[PDB]
């Protein structure tokens, strides 16, 4: 077949990255349940930003919510290692 | 919902508003660089 | 070969850029008046 | 043949120093053809190989956003050619592709250098030109 | 910008009040939950 | 949360909605949530009293906490599995108030005198519902009676809030969070509300509620939650690097057995290797632990039959390393269980009068036994499942060691293959991966009753399938790996580790 | 350099920290090639095996010339004769885009 | 619409002040509240969920009364009405607890129901007649045993006629459905 044209492969790559974090969002939203109220405040604010970005397919929001949801995921991972 | 706004249920309110906090005690026993001990305290901020 | 470096200094935003080399009567390239030499790339944030 | 079939091409680079002794550490500046992405796992073999290294920040990104590649060689033989190779695949679906380029130099001297191009139709990758004595013209066009 | 609201206290004590706000076309929001004292009518007297 | 103590006296009340708002396949997912939960609680060795109530218009009590059968995890699982969705479908109400009063009757003592241990006893209530109660009064007022009965939150001097925890699960396709949030207990930094998507990835749900305060040092217990790292998946796994001049860098694996001790193979080291040249990292930190001494087995000799014509001799290839400073156990650092110990008895849920031979019968039957080891792929630890060839193919597993390089023309098979070696590898009954040489020294792990037991130590393999530092591409099928049986070296381990108080039989 | 001198009996050797940033003030990501050398009077002598290859991350890198490599570099095994002479460093840093290059020098 | 507000003060003293409100219906703009002595309740609501008699489809309406919001279903009979300050109380006798309740059933004694006095214009209840009612957990109010059932927008009231009024052709089918639902809810519950 004809190979995918220009932006179509790039937008699909961004959607696959956002889809990967949303699979463990329910795990991470849970994982803040035994953590401090800041993490639980941050992830539910950051979670809807990723959820809307995937279904709206806006490039600006899908870029920002990818790095935003990655940031709180790093904070949770450092929280769970420091809490033991 | 489908509209371009955060839904109300997952809006998380700020509620920790005390004026004075961090009433803690610590001892400088870190390795003295030129006689100076460098202590790192990772602390939560408030709302 | 010429090297054009494009810089993105957003803290959380990667950018979709159309970049184009213009036609030149003094320089031969794929850019002519009818057919333009343009590309579509993506720059990650805090990177070049 | 093992049902991995796609539009596939392989790029091979070789060089040799002409001086009286082996030249020391040199650097490979490689630019992809437009819409071409290298096969990652071939460069994994090259980076971990002896006398060879690829920088981490360049290496771990890879895939479609890889257009310029930086490869460091610790030595090149002066008697015979040193070589390496990796696969490339098109993903952009565009005609009149831009040719790629490979430039060689050393870290102590950038000025003495050498640069060759490549294209899947033109031998030196310099496309097509017309020239009468000293006066030359652009010619990457249809004939009429 | 200040947004006034009108309320009526119904029961004595340090009771809870909560408000929220969210912006359109961006996913930035804020909520404020504070408590204020509901005092029954009357005043301090320090007699001997 | 929930405290797990070996002196535990805990009542676990299980309430399940059976109304038409749930759906049978959500009801089955509700049951599968509870069965893995009951099994994970029984993996600690705590004996709670289970209560089982399914309700619709009217509650039906299946297991009462007063019965002696309430402390049997296997029986309560059998009673829960038999319950069908359409068992009381014809009464399809949602009367949560009467079910809480039934739980209130369970905790209620006769007359005015509670039995002793009422303040000792912990109480746990688990509810699964749609959040749409439609029959009976308000359910919240029975909880206030439960709060008043147990004297919780009614005194400033002794608040007693740590004795009651209430969790609510949102099951069914349609769910009301507002009723569910009011029903659930509300505590700081403790998750008590679960949604419909929370029913998947059960190990993460259990990780939030469980507090392992009194259960830190339990051997062979794994956190399998999706956010867990390699060391949540393997708390015992220790990475051992030997960097010495001329010899160069070499890496081997180990397994935590005590606060000061790690078990690994002996051929990774030698007598000439110094203690400062050996670095061990257990929890994954870049801070390598300093060691005190390495205890070689007394009967180990790599050059035992060197004058006869055998190049390397791998009999008794085990060693114990002593740390300079002891470890502190955690979620990523825990020892692995050793056979014929009191910890292994509590792990296998055996009576305490179980002998060392009875455990030997269960762990090593004369058959193909499921097992696993750990390997590295691009600096990340991963699991490899193998089979121990202890059955009729044990002789065929030993015979493929003739193809080992350097040992092709050695006549006697029983000389080089001692009874210490356990044999894995091959393609029968299933394809078993072969170790890299960096994988040497690791444990051979067998899984029984939600716990993990070590039965061997990784020794050597017939064909080095990982010669080009990668295990890439297929290899011949007669490549076997050998592992040192722990039952053979049990008197040496019991002699050395009786000072560590592991409870040897 | 951590210190603007070298003490001959320092077992660690001379440590030279690399800092690289764009002209407008943002951090440079790249890889540096650095070599050490010795200056005697007006004459400079180069040590060839002192070459190292370090990535420049967070706008920074660090390279050390050890005491053994310098003593292996010189053919004189006396540490006493090294006093009175001077060192120089020459570094070559290239971005991970590979489009520009800067050569710097610390000497004396 | 939200009422506005005017506050007066001086720059040297904010504490001594005065604040008045305004609304195009309310004189002081303070909306509507109910209060008995010191205990007050919110009242910016509809008087009750009044239906315009066209929905005689009781079979839909009674099946929708099995929704999870309903915390009591009672059959009552009004005895005596007394006006008061800003409210009026309706002394009713509870005949049977059809669904739920959350308190003791007792059955056969006086149970006081209270409405805002501005809701007399919406619907006037008449003494000695039977009435069928249902509400939710925020309707019953006060402290035990002086609990008070307050009539609000979520409360529903309809007259259950006497035996001779049922024999009229309009209340023929009406007394059927309310009588069947009485049997339907003390036998079958809700199937949700
Ligand atoms: C409870 O209902 C079933 C129980 O397994 C699941 O139903 C999902 O939802 C609809 C059916 O109503 C299907 O289209 C999905 O494919 C179902 N499966 C999924 C999401 O895995 C589900 O687990 C539960 N939730 C819902 C909303 O039905
Ligand atoms: C069981 O309950 C009692 C409540 O009477 C708890 O309080 C203790 O009571 C005994 C005797 O009345 C005192 O000696 C203790 O000092 C009390 N403990 C306190 C005040 O913390 C107690 O939790 C339990 N008593 C036991 C186990 O003897
Ligand atoms: Mg129901």
PDB file of N, CA, C and O in Angstrom, chain D residues 79-124:
ATOM      1  N   UNK D  79      45.878   1.312   5.880  1.00  0.00           N
ATOM      2  CA  UNK D  79      46.209   0.300   4.886  1.00  0.00           C
ATOM      3  C   UNK D  79      44.979  -0.198   4.137  1.00  0.00           C
ATOM      4  O   UNK D  79      45.049  -0.446   2.928  1.00  0.00           O
ATOM      5  N   UNK D  80      43.852  -0.349   4.833  1.00  0.00           N
ATOM      6  CA  UNK D  80      42.628  -0.876   4.246  1.00  0.00           C
ATOM      7  C   UNK D  80      41.428  -0.162   4.857  1.00  0.00           C
ATOM      8  O   UNK D  80      41.553   0.606   5.814  1.00  0.00           O
ATOM      9  N   UNK D  81      40.256  -0.424   4.284  1.00  0.00           N
ATOM     10  CA  UNK D  81      39.053   0.324   4.623  1.00  0.00           C
ATOM     11  C   UNK D  81      38.403  -0.205   5.897  1.00  0.00           C
ATOM     12  O   UNK D  81      38.350  -1.415   6.131  1.00  0.00           O
ATOM     13  N   UNK D  82      37.905   0.716   6.720  1.00  0.00           N
ATOM     14  CA  UNK D  82      37.042   0.392   7.848  1.00  0.00           C
ATOM     15  C   UNK D  82      35.603   0.731   7.484  1.00  0.00           C
ATOM     16  O   UNK D  82      35.332   1.804   6.937  1.00  0.00           O
ATOM     17  N   UNK D  83      34.677  -0.173   7.802  1.00  0.00           N
ATOM     18  CA  UNK D  83      33.318  -0.066   7.290  1.00  0.00           C
ATOM     19  C   UNK D  83      32.292  -0.367   8.374  1.00  0.00           C
ATOM     20  O   UNK D  83      32.600  -0.946   9.418  1.00  0.00           O
ATOM     21  N   UNK D  84      31.053   0.038   8.086  1.00  0.00           N
ATOM     22  CA  UNK D  84      29.876  -0.253   8.897  1.00  0.00           C
ATOM     23  C   UNK D  84      28.655  -0.102   7.998  1.00  0.00           C
ATOM     24  O   UNK D  84      28.733   0.486   6.916  1.00  0.00           O
ATOM     25  N   UNK D  85      27.518  -0.623   8.463  1.00  0.00           N
ATOM     26  CA  UNK D  85      26.304  -0.595   7.655  1.00  0.00           C
ATOM     27  C   UNK D  85      25.073  -0.687   8.546  1.00  0.00           C
ATOM     28  O   UNK D  85      25.119  -1.278   9.628  1.00  0.00           O
ATOM     29  N   UNK D  86      23.969  -0.109   8.063  1.00  0.00           N
ATOM     30  CA  UNK D  86      22.676  -0.200   8.734  1.00  0.00           C
ATOM     31  C   UNK D  86      21.569   0.011   7.707  1.00  0.00           C
ATOM     32  O   UNK D  86      21.800   0.526   6.611  1.00  0.00           O
ATOM     33  N   UNK D  87      20.361  -0.397   8.086  1.00  0.00           N
ATOM     34  CA  UNK D  87      19.186  -0.340   7.226  1.00  0.00           C
ATOM     35  C   UNK D  87      18.484   1.006   7.354  1.00  0.00           C
ATOM     36  O   UNK D  87      18.582   1.676   8.381  1.00  0.00           O
ATOM     37  N   UNK D  88      17.769   1.396   6.292  1.00  0.00           N
ATOM     38  CA  UNK D  88      16.889   2.562   6.303  1.00  0.00           C
ATOM     39  C   UNK D  88      15.582   2.191   5.610  1.00  0.00           C
ATOM     40  O   UNK D  88      15.543   1.317   4.739  1.00  0.00           O
ATOM     41  N   UNK D  89      14.498   2.858   6.013  1.00  0.00           N
ATOM     42  CA  UNK D  89      13.169   2.607   5.467  1.00  0.00           C
ATOM     43  C   UNK D  89      12.442   3.928   5.282  1.00  0.00           C
ATOM     44  O   UNK D  89      12.534   4.814   6.134  1.00  0.00           O
ATOM     45  N   UNK D  90      11.705   4.048   4.181  1.00  0.00           N
ATOM     46  CA  UNK D  90      10.936   5.257   3.926  1.00  0.00           C
ATOM     47  C   UNK D  90       9.602   5.187   4.659  1.00  0.00           C
ATOM     48  O   UNK D  90       9.016   4.110   4.804  1.00  0.00           O
ATOM     49  N   UNK D  91       9.143   6.336   5.172  1.00  0.00           N
ATOM     50  CA  UNK D  91       7.832   6.405   5.796  1.00  0.00           C
ATOM     51  C   UNK D  91       6.997   7.598   5.352  1.00  0.00           C
ATOM     52  O   UNK D  91       5.881   7.747   5.849  1.00  0.00           O
ATOM     53  N   UNK D  92       7.515   8.481   4.497  1.00  0.00           N
ATOM     54  CA  UNK D  92       6.886   9.777   4.251  1.00  0.00           C
ATOM     55  C   UNK D  92       6.037   9.819   2.990  1.00  0.00           C
ATOM     56  O   UNK D  92       5.114  10.642   2.917  1.00  0.00           O
ATOM     57  N   UNK D  93       6.364   8.972   2.003  1.00  0.00           N
ATOM     58  CA  UNK D  93       5.685   8.828   0.708  1.00  0.00           C
ATOM     59  C   UNK D  93       5.722  10.141  -0.087  1.00  0.00           C
ATOM     60  O   UNK D  93       4.710  10.812  -0.300  1.00  0.00           O
ATOM     61  N   UNK D  94       6.933  10.488  -0.524  1.00  0.00           N
ATOM     62  CA  UNK D  94       7.174  11.709  -1.288  1.00  0.00           C
ATOM     63  C   UNK D  94       8.098  11.365  -2.458  1.00  0.00           C
ATOM     64  O   UNK D  94       8.969  10.495  -2.342  1.00  0.00           O
ATOM     65  N   UNK D  95       7.851  11.988  -3.609  1.00  0.00           N
ATOM     66  CA  UNK D  95       8.725  11.893  -4.768  1.00  0.00           C
ATOM     67  C   UNK D  95       9.734  13.040  -4.760  1.00  0.00           C
ATOM     68  O   UNK D  95       9.550  14.039  -4.057  1.00  0.00           O
ATOM     69  N   UNK D  96      10.791  12.879  -5.570  1.00  0.00           N
ATOM     70  CA  UNK D  96      11.979  13.751  -5.621  1.00  0.00           C
ATOM     71  C   UNK D  96      12.597  13.911  -4.232  1.00  0.00           C
ATOM     72  O   UNK D  96      12.594  14.990  -3.635  1.00  0.00           O
ATOM     73  N   UNK D  97      13.094  12.786  -3.712  1.00  0.00           N
ATOM     74  CA  UNK D  97      13.649  12.742  -2.366  1.00  0.00           C
ATOM     75  C   UNK D  97      14.970  13.502  -2.301  1.00  0.00           C
ATOM     76  O   UNK D  97      15.731  13.572  -3.276  1.00  0.00           O
ATOM     77  N   UNK D  98      15.234  14.095  -1.151  1.00  0.00           N
ATOM     78  CA  UNK D  98      16.501  14.775  -0.934  1.00  0.00           C
ATOM     79  C   UNK D  98      17.598  13.741  -0.710  1.00  0.00           C
ATOM     80  O   UNK D  98      17.391  12.785   0.045  1.00  0.00           O
ATOM     81  N   UNK D  99      18.746  13.868  -1.373  1.00  0.00           N
ATOM     82  CA  UNK D  99      19.860  12.950  -1.112  1.00  0.00           C
ATOM     83  C   UNK D  99      20.456  13.164   0.274  1.00  0.00           C
ATOM     84  O   UNK D  99      20.357  14.239   0.868  1.00  0.00           O
ATOM     85  N   UNK D 100      21.079  12.104   0.794  1.00  0.00           N
ATOM     86  CA  UNK D 100      21.764  12.176   2.067  1.00  0.00           C
ATOM     87  C   UNK D 100      23.225  12.562   1.908  1.00  0.00           C
ATOM     88  O   UNK D 100      23.741  12.721   0.804  1.00  0.00           O
ATOM     89  N   UNK D 101      23.900  12.710   3.048  1.00  0.00           N
ATOM     90  CA  UNK D 101      25.283  13.165   3.049  1.00  0.00           C
ATOM     91  C   UNK D 101      26.040  12.546   4.215  1.00  0.00           C
ATOM     92  O   UNK D 101      25.477  12.315   5.288  1.00  0.00           O
ATOM     93  N   UNK D 102      27.326  12.271   3.985  1.00  0.00           N
ATOM     94  CA  UNK D 102      28.248  11.764   5.002  1.00  0.00           C
ATOM     95  C   UNK D 102      29.506  12.625   4.956  1.00  0.00           C
ATOM     96  O   UNK D 102      30.138  12.739   3.900  1.00  0.00           O
ATOM     97  N   UNK D 103      29.871  13.225   6.091  1.00  0.00           N
ATOM     98  CA  UNK D 103      31.079  14.036   6.196  1.00  0.00           C
ATOM     99  C   UNK D 103      32.022  13.431   7.229  1.00  0.00           C
ATOM    100  O   UNK D 103      31.583  12.979   8.291  1.00  0.00           O
ATOM    101  N   UNK D 104      33.322  13.425   6.918  1.00  0.00           N
ATOM    102  CA  UNK D 104      34.349  12.873   7.795  1.00  0.00           C
ATOM    103  C   UNK D 104      35.351  13.970   8.148  1.00  0.00           C
ATOM    104  O   UNK D 104      35.661  14.836   7.320  1.00  0.00           O
ATOM    105  N   UNK D 105      35.800  13.960   9.405  1.00  0.00           N
ATOM    106  CA  UNK D 105      36.788  14.893   9.948  1.00  0.00           C
ATOM    107  C   UNK D 105      37.288  14.339  11.275  1.00  0.00           C
ATOM    108  O   UNK D 105      36.769  13.345  11.791  1.00  0.00           O
ATOM    109  N   UNK D 106      38.293  15.009  11.829  1.00  0.00           N
ATOM    110  CA  UNK D 106      38.839  14.681  13.137  1.00  0.00           C
ATOM    111  C   UNK D 106      38.557  15.821  14.108  1.00  0.00           C
ATOM    112  O   UNK D 106      38.229  16.941  13.707  1.00  0.00           O
ATOM    113  N   UNK D 107      38.686  15.516  15.403  1.00  0.00           N
ATOM    114  CA  UNK D 107      38.355  16.482  16.447  1.00  0.00           C
ATOM    115  C   UNK D 107      39.378  17.607  16.558  1.00  0.00           C
ATOM    116  O   UNK D 107      39.031  18.695  17.032  1.00  0.00           O
ATOM    117  N   UNK D 108      40.619  17.373  16.133  1.00  0.00           N
ATOM    118  CA  UNK D 108      41.654  18.397  16.176  1.00  0.00           C
ATOM    119  C   UNK D 108      41.699  19.242  14.910  1.00  0.00           C
ATOM    120  O   UNK D 108      42.382  20.273  14.899  1.00  0.00           O
ATOM    121  N   UNK D 109      40.980  18.844  13.861  1.00  0.00           N
ATOM    122  CA  UNK D 109      41.033  19.555  12.585  1.00  0.00           C
ATOM    123  C   UNK D 109      39.725  19.305  11.847  1.00  0.00           C
ATOM    124  O   UNK D 109      39.491  18.199  11.353  1.00  0.00           O
ATOM    125  N   UNK D 110      38.885  20.338  11.758  1.00  0.00           N
ATOM    126  CA  UNK D 110      37.639  20.265  11.003  1.00  0.00           C
ATOM    127  C   UNK D 110      37.821  20.681   9.549  1.00  0.00           C
ATOM    128  O   UNK D 110      37.067  20.220   8.678  1.00  0.00           O
ATOM    129  N   UNK D 111      38.838  21.507   9.276  1.00  0.00           N
ATOM    130  CA  UNK D 111      39.025  22.111   7.956  1.00  0.00           C
ATOM    131  C   UNK D 111      39.391  21.081   6.891  1.00  0.00           C
ATOM    132  O   UNK D 111      38.764  21.038   5.826  1.00  0.00           O
ATOM    133  N   UNK D 112      40.408  20.254   7.140  1.00  0.00           N
ATOM    134  CA  UNK D 112      40.656  19.134   6.235  1.00  0.00           C
ATOM    135  C   UNK D 112      39.574  18.073   6.448  1.00  0.00           C
ATOM    136  O   UNK D 112      39.409  17.537   7.551  1.00  0.00           O
ATOM    137  N   UNK D 113      38.788  17.823   5.407  1.00  0.00           N
ATOM    138  CA  UNK D 113      37.580  17.019   5.532  1.00  0.00           C
ATOM    139  C   UNK D 113      37.240  16.438   4.166  1.00  0.00           C
ATOM    140  O   UNK D 113      37.910  16.711   3.167  1.00  0.00           O
ATOM    141  N   UNK D 114      36.184  15.629   4.134  1.00  0.00           N
ATOM    142  CA  UNK D 114      35.720  15.001   2.907  1.00  0.00           C
ATOM    143  C   UNK D 114      34.234  14.704   3.051  1.00  0.00           C
ATOM    144  O   UNK D 114      33.783  14.291   4.123  1.00  0.00           O
ATOM    145  N   UNK D 115      33.478  14.924   1.975  1.00  0.00           N
ATOM    146  CA  UNK D 115      32.027  14.783   2.009  1.00  0.00           C
ATOM    147  C   UNK D 115      31.539  14.133   0.723  1.00  0.00           C
ATOM    148  O   UNK D 115      31.865  14.599  -0.373  1.00  0.00           O
ATOM    149  N   UNK D 116      30.755  13.063   0.859  1.00  0.00           N
ATOM    150  CA  UNK D 116      30.156  12.366  -0.271  1.00  0.00           C
ATOM    151  C   UNK D 116      28.652  12.264  -0.061  1.00  0.00           C
ATOM    152  O   UNK D 116      28.170  12.219   1.075  1.00  0.00           O
ATOM    153  N   UNK D 117      27.914  12.217  -1.167  1.00  0.00           N
ATOM    154  CA  UNK D 117      26.459  12.151  -1.148  1.00  0.00           C
ATOM    155  C   UNK D 117      26.000  10.819  -1.726  1.00  0.00           C
ATOM    156  O   UNK D 117      26.791  10.046  -2.275  1.00  0.00           O
ATOM    157  N   UNK D 118      24.696  10.565  -1.611  1.00  0.00           N
ATOM    158  CA  UNK D 118      24.124   9.326  -2.116  1.00  0.00           C
ATOM    159  C   UNK D 118      22.646   9.527  -2.419  1.00  0.00           C
ATOM    160  O   UNK D 118      21.937  10.228  -1.694  1.00  0.00           O
ATOM    161  N   UNK D 119      22.187   8.855  -3.472  1.00  0.00           N
ATOM    162  CA  UNK D 119      20.813   8.885  -3.956  1.00  0.00           C
ATOM    163  C   UNK D 119      20.596   7.558  -4.665  1.00  0.00           C
ATOM    164  O   UNK D 119      21.541   7.032  -5.266  1.00  0.00           O
ATOM    165  N   UNK D 120      19.375   6.980  -4.619  1.00  0.00           N
ATOM    166  CA  UNK D 120      19.161   5.674  -5.272  1.00  0.00           C
ATOM    167  C   UNK D 120      19.104   5.665  -6.803  1.00  0.00           C
ATOM    168  O   UNK D 120      18.644   4.676  -7.380  1.00  0.00           O
ATOM    169  N   UNK D 121      19.558   6.723  -7.480  1.00  0.00           N
ATOM    170  CA  UNK D 121      19.593   6.769  -8.939  1.00  0.00           C
ATOM    171  C   UNK D 121      20.905   7.386  -9.411  1.00  0.00           C
ATOM    172  O   UNK D 121      21.491   6.931 -10.398  1.00  0.00           O
ATOM    173  N   UNK D 122      21.367   8.421  -8.713  1.00  0.00           N
ATOM    174  CA  UNK D 122      22.589   9.129  -9.078  1.00  0.00           C
ATOM    175  C   UNK D 122      23.761   8.546  -8.300  1.00  0.00           C
ATOM    176  O   UNK D 122      23.637   8.237  -7.111  1.00  0.00           O
ATOM    177  N   UNK D 123      24.890   8.368  -8.999  1.00  0.00           N
ATOM    178  CA  UNK D 123      26.044   7.666  -8.437  1.00  0.00           C
ATOM    179  C   UNK D 123      26.701   8.447  -7.303  1.00  0.00           C
ATOM    180  O   UNK D 123      26.925   7.904  -6.213  1.00  0.00           O
ATOM    181  N   UNK D 124      27.018   9.715  -7.532  1.00  0.00           N
ATOM    182  CA  UNK D 124      27.598  10.540  -6.484  1.00  0.00           C
ATOM    183  C   UNK D 124      26.555  11.324  -5.704  1.00  0.00           C
ATOM    184  O   UNK D 124      26.925  12.090  -4.810  1.00  0.00           O
TER     185      UNK D 124
END
